[PDB]
Coordinates of all heavy atoms in Angstrom, one line a residue:
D1 N 136.0 159.5 153.1 CA 137.2 159.7 152.4 C 138.3 159.6 153.3 O 138.4 160.4 154.2 CB 137.3 160.9 151.6 CG 137.6 160.6 150.1 OD1 138.7 160.5 149.7 OD2 136.6 160.5 149.3
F2 N 139.2 158.6 153.0 CA 140.3 158.4 153.9 C 141.6 158.9 153.4 O 142.6 158.3 153.6 CB 140.4 156.8 154.1 CG 139.6 156.4 155.3 CD1 138.6 155.4 155.1 CD2 139.8 156.8 156.6 CE1 137.9 155.0 156.2 CE2 139.1 156.4 157.7 CZ 138.1 155.5 157.5
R3 N 141.6 160.0 152.7 CA 142.8 160.6 152.2 C 143.8 160.9 153.3 O 145.0 160.5 153.2 CB 142.6 161.9 151.4 CG 142.0 161.7 150.0 CD 141.5 163.0 149.4 NE 140.5 163.7 150.3 CZ 140.8 164.6 151.2 NH1 142.0 165.0 151.4 NH2 139.8 165.1 151.9
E4 N 143.3 161.5 154.4 CA 144.2 161.8 155.5 C 144.8 160.5 156.1 O 146.0 160.5 156.4 CB 143.5 162.6 156.5
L5 N 143.9 159.5 156.4 CA 144.4 158.3 157.0 C 145.1 157.4 156.0 O 146.0 156.7 156.4 CB 143.2 157.5 157.5 CG 143.5 156.4 158.5 CD1 143.9 156.9 159.9 CD2 142.3 155.5 158.6
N6 N 144.8 157.5 154.7 CA 145.5 156.7 153.7 C 147.0 157.0 153.6 O 147.8 156.1 153.4 CB 144.8 156.8 152.4 CG 143.6 155.9 152.2 OD1 143.1 155.4 153.2 ND2 143.2 155.7 151.0
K7 N 147.3 158.3 153.8 CA 148.7 158.8 153.7 C 149.4 158.8 155.0 O 150.6 159.1 155.1 CB 148.8 160.1 153.1 CG 148.1 161.2 153.9 CD 147.9 162.5 153.1 CE 147.4 163.7 153.9 NZ 146.4 164.5 153.2
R8 N 148.8 158.4 156.1 CA 149.4 158.3 157.4 C 149.6 156.9 158.0 O 150.4 156.7 158.9 CB 148.6 159.1 158.5 CG 148.6 160.6 158.2 CD 148.2 161.3 159.5 NE 147.6 162.6 159.2 CZ 147.5 163.6 160.1 NH1 148.1 163.6 161.3 NH2 146.9 164.8 159.7
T9 N 148.9 155.9 157.4 CA 149.0 154.5 157.8 C 150.3 153.9 157.3 O 150.8 154.4 156.3 CB 147.8 153.7 157.4 OG1 147.5 153.9 156.0 CG2 146.6 154.0 158.3
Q10 N 150.8 152.9 157.9 CA 152.0 152.2 157.5 C 151.8 151.6 156.1 O 150.7 151.1 155.8 CB 152.4 151.1 158.5 CG 151.3 150.0 158.6 CD 151.9 148.8 159.3 OE1 152.7 148.9 160.2 NE2 151.3 147.6 159.0
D11 N 152.8 151.7 155.3 CA 152.7 151.1 154.0 C 152.5 149.6 154.0 O 153.1 148.9 154.9 CB 154.0 151.4 153.2
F12 N 151.6 149.1 153.2 CA 151.3 147.6 153.1 C 152.0 147.1 151.8 O 152.3 147.8 150.9 CB 149.8 147.4 153.1 CG 149.2 147.8 154.4 CD1 148.8 149.1 154.6 CD2 148.9 146.8 155.3 CE1 148.2 149.4 155.8 CE2 148.2 147.2 156.5 CZ 147.9 148.5 156.7
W13 N 152.1 145.8 151.8 CA 152.6 145.1 150.6 C 151.4 144.4 149.9 O 150.9 143.4 150.4 CB 153.7 144.0 151.0 CG 154.4 143.5 149.8 CD1 154.2 142.2 149.3 CD2 155.3 144.1 149.0 NE1 155.0 142.0 148.2 CE2 155.7 143.2 148.0 CE3 155.9 145.4 149.0 CZ2 156.7 143.5 147.0 CZ3 156.9 145.7 148.0 CH2 157.2 144.7 147.0
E14 N 151.0 144.9 148.8 CA 150.0 144.3 148.0 C 150.6 143.1 147.3 O 151.2 143.1 146.2 CB 149.4 145.3 146.9 CG 148.4 144.7 146.0 CD 147.3 144.0 146.7 OE1 147.5 142.9 147.3 OE2 146.1 144.6 146.7
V15 N 150.4 141.9 147.9 CA 151.0 140.7 147.5 C 150.6 140.4 146.1 O 151.5 140.0 145.2 CB 150.7 139.5 148.5 CG1 151.1 138.2 147.8 CG2 151.4 139.7 149.8
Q16 N 149.3 140.5 145.8 CA 148.8 140.2 144.4 C 148.4 141.5 143.8 O 147.3 142.0 144.0 CB 147.6 139.3 144.5 CG 147.4 138.5 143.2 CD 146.0 137.9 143.1 OE1 145.4 137.4 144.1 NE2 145.4 138.0 141.9
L17 N 149.4 142.1 143.1 CA 149.1 143.4 142.4 C 148.5 143.2 141.0 O 147.5 143.8 140.6 CB 150.4 144.2 142.3
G18 N 149.1 142.2 140.2 CA 148.5 141.9 138.9 C 147.3 141.0 139.0 O 146.9 140.6 140.1
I19 N 146.8 140.6 137.9 CA 145.6 139.7 137.8 C 146.0 138.6 136.9 O 146.8 138.7 136.0 CB 144.4 140.5 137.3 CG1 144.7 141.2 136.0 CG2 144.0 141.5 138.3 CD1 143.5 141.5 135.2
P20 N 145.3 137.4 137.1 CA 145.6 136.3 136.2 C 145.0 136.5 134.8 O 143.8 136.7 134.6 CB 145.0 135.1 136.9 CG 143.8 135.7 137.7 CD 144.3 137.1 138.1
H21 N 145.9 136.3 133.8 CA 145.4 136.3 132.4 C 144.6 135.0 132.2 O 145.0 134.0 132.6 CB 146.5 136.4 131.4 CG 146.1 136.9 130.1 ND1 145.7 136.0 129.1 CD2 146.1 138.1 129.5 CE1 145.4 136.7 128.0 NE2 145.7 138.0 128.2
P22 N 143.4 135.1 131.5 CA 142.6 133.9 131.3 C 143.4 132.8 130.6 O 143.1 131.6 130.8 CB 141.4 134.4 130.5 CG 141.3 135.9 130.8 CD 142.7 136.3 131.0
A23 N 144.3 133.2 129.7 CA 145.1 132.2 129.0 C 145.9 131.3 130.0 O 146.1 130.1 129.7 CB 146.0 132.9 128.0
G24 N 146.3 131.9 131.1 CA 147.0 131.2 132.1 C 146.2 130.2 132.9 O 146.7 129.2 133.5
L25 N 144.9 130.5 133.0 CA 144.0 129.6 133.7 C 143.9 128.2 133.0 O 144.5 128.0 131.9 CB 142.6 130.2 133.8 CG 142.5 131.6 134.3 CD1 141.1 132.1 134.1 CD2 142.9 131.7 135.7
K26 N 143.2 127.3 133.6 CA 143.1 125.9 133.1 C 141.6 125.5 133.0 O 140.8 126.0 133.7 CB 143.8 124.9 134.0 CG 145.3 125.2 134.1 CD 145.9 124.7 135.4 CE 147.3 125.4 135.7 NZ 147.1 126.9 135.9
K27 N 141.3 124.7 132.0 CA 140.0 124.2 131.8 C 139.4 123.6 133.0 O 140.0 122.8 133.7 CB 139.9 123.3 130.6 CG 138.5 122.9 130.2 CD 138.5 121.7 129.2 CE 137.1 121.4 128.7 NZ 136.1 121.5 129.7
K28 N 138.2 124.0 133.4 CA 137.4 123.5 134.5 C 136.1 123.0 134.1 O 135.4 123.7 133.3 CB 137.3 124.5 135.7 CG 138.6 125.0 136.2 CD 139.3 124.0 137.1 CE 140.7 124.5 137.5 NZ 141.6 123.4 137.7
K29 N 135.7 121.8 134.5 CA 134.4 121.3 134.1 C 133.2 122.2 134.7 O 132.3 122.5 134.0 CB 134.2 119.9 134.6 CG 133.3 119.0 133.8 CD 133.2 117.6 134.2 CE 134.5 116.8 133.9 NZ 134.4 115.4 134.3
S30 N 133.4 122.6 135.9 CA 132.4 123.5 136.6 C 133.1 124.6 137.3 O 134.1 124.4 137.9 CB 131.5 122.7 137.6 OG 130.9 121.6 136.9
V31 N 132.5 125.8 137.2 CA 133.1 127.0 137.8 C 131.9 127.8 138.4 O 130.9 128.0 137.7 CB 133.9 127.9 136.9 CG1 134.5 129.1 137.6 CG2 135.1 127.0 136.3
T32 N 132.1 128.4 139.6 CA 131.1 129.2 140.2 C 131.8 130.5 140.8 O 133.0 130.4 141.1 CB 130.3 128.5 141.3 OG1 129.2 129.3 141.7 CG2 131.2 128.3 142.5
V33 N 131.1 131.6 140.9 CA 131.5 132.8 141.4 C 130.8 133.1 142.7 O 129.5 133.2 142.6 CB 131.4 134.0 140.4 CG1 131.8 135.3 141.1 CG2 132.4 133.7 139.2
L34 N 131.4 133.3 143.8 CA 130.8 133.6 145.1 C 131.2 135.1 145.4 O 132.3 135.4 145.7 CB 131.3 132.7 146.2 CG 131.0 131.2 146.0 CD1 131.9 130.4 146.9 CD2 129.5 131.0 146.4
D35 N 130.2 136.0 145.3 CA 130.4 137.4 145.7 C 130.3 137.5 147.2 O 129.2 137.3 147.8 CB 129.3 138.2 145.0 CG 129.7 139.7 144.9 OD1 130.7 140.0 144.3 OD2 129.0 140.5 145.5
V36 N 131.4 137.8 147.8 CA 131.4 137.8 149.3 C 130.7 139.0 149.8 O 131.3 140.1 149.8 CB 132.9 137.8 149.8 CG1 133.0 137.9 151.3 CG2 133.6 136.5 149.3
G37 N 129.5 138.9 150.2 CA 128.7 140.0 150.8 C 129.3 140.6 152.0 O 129.7 139.8 152.9
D38 N 129.5 141.9 152.0 CA 130.2 142.6 153.1 C 131.6 142.0 153.2 O 131.9 141.5 154.3 CB 129.4 142.5 154.4 CG 128.1 143.4 154.3 OD1 128.0 144.2 153.3 OD2 127.3 143.3 155.3
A39 N 132.4 142.1 152.2 CA 133.7 141.4 152.2 C 134.6 142.0 153.3 O 135.0 141.3 154.2 CB 134.3 141.6 150.8
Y40 N 134.9 143.3 153.2 CA 135.8 143.9 154.1 C 135.1 144.1 155.5 O 135.8 144.0 156.5 CB 136.2 145.3 153.6 CG 137.0 145.3 152.3 CD1 137.3 146.5 151.6 CD2 137.4 144.1 151.7 CE1 137.9 146.5 150.4 CE2 138.1 144.1 150.5 CZ 138.4 145.3 149.9 OH 139.0 145.3 148.7
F41 N 133.8 144.2 155.5 CA 133.1 144.4 156.8 C 133.0 143.1 157.6 O 132.3 143.2 158.7 CB 131.7 145.0 156.5 CG 131.7 146.4 156.1 CD1 132.9 147.1 155.8 CD2 130.5 147.1 156.1 CE1 132.9 148.4 155.5 CE2 130.5 148.5 155.7 CZ 131.7 149.1 155.4
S42 N 133.6 142.0 157.2 CA 133.6 140.8 158.0 C 134.9 140.5 158.6 O 135.0 139.5 159.4 CB 133.2 139.6 157.1
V43 N 135.9 141.3 158.4 CA 137.3 141.2 158.9 C 137.5 142.2 160.0 O 137.5 143.4 159.7 CB 138.4 141.3 157.8 CG1 139.7 141.3 158.5 CG2 138.2 140.1 156.9
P44 N 137.7 141.9 161.3 CA 137.8 142.9 162.3 C 139.1 143.7 162.1 O 140.1 143.3 161.5 CB 137.9 142.1 163.6 CG 138.4 140.7 163.2 CD 137.9 140.5 161.8
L45 N 139.0 145.0 162.6 CA 140.2 145.9 162.5 C 141.0 145.8 163.8 O 140.5 145.5 164.8 CB 139.7 147.3 162.2 CG 140.7 148.4 161.9 CD1 141.5 148.0 160.7 CD2 140.0 149.7 161.7
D46 N 142.3 146.2 163.6 CA 143.2 146.2 164.8 C 142.6 147.0 165.9 O 142.2 148.2 165.7 CB 144.5 146.7 164.4 CG 145.6 146.5 165.5 OD1 145.7 145.3 166.0 OD2 146.2 147.5 165.8
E47 N 142.6 146.4 167.1 CA 142.0 147.1 168.3 C 142.7 148.4 168.5 O 142.0 149.4 168.9 CB 142.1 146.2 169.5 CG 141.5 146.8 170.8 CD 140.0 147.0 170.6 OE1 139.3 146.3 169.8 OE2 139.4 147.9 171.3

């Protein structure tokens, strides 16, 4: 639980806060979903 660290780190800008409404999407002949295994654990943290 990162409550202590969450309220002490610099504020970030969540560039994409909302989500795309499906109506806004466009028809695609083929679509696939890639679940990024260990998503956050593949990006190094600041030294």
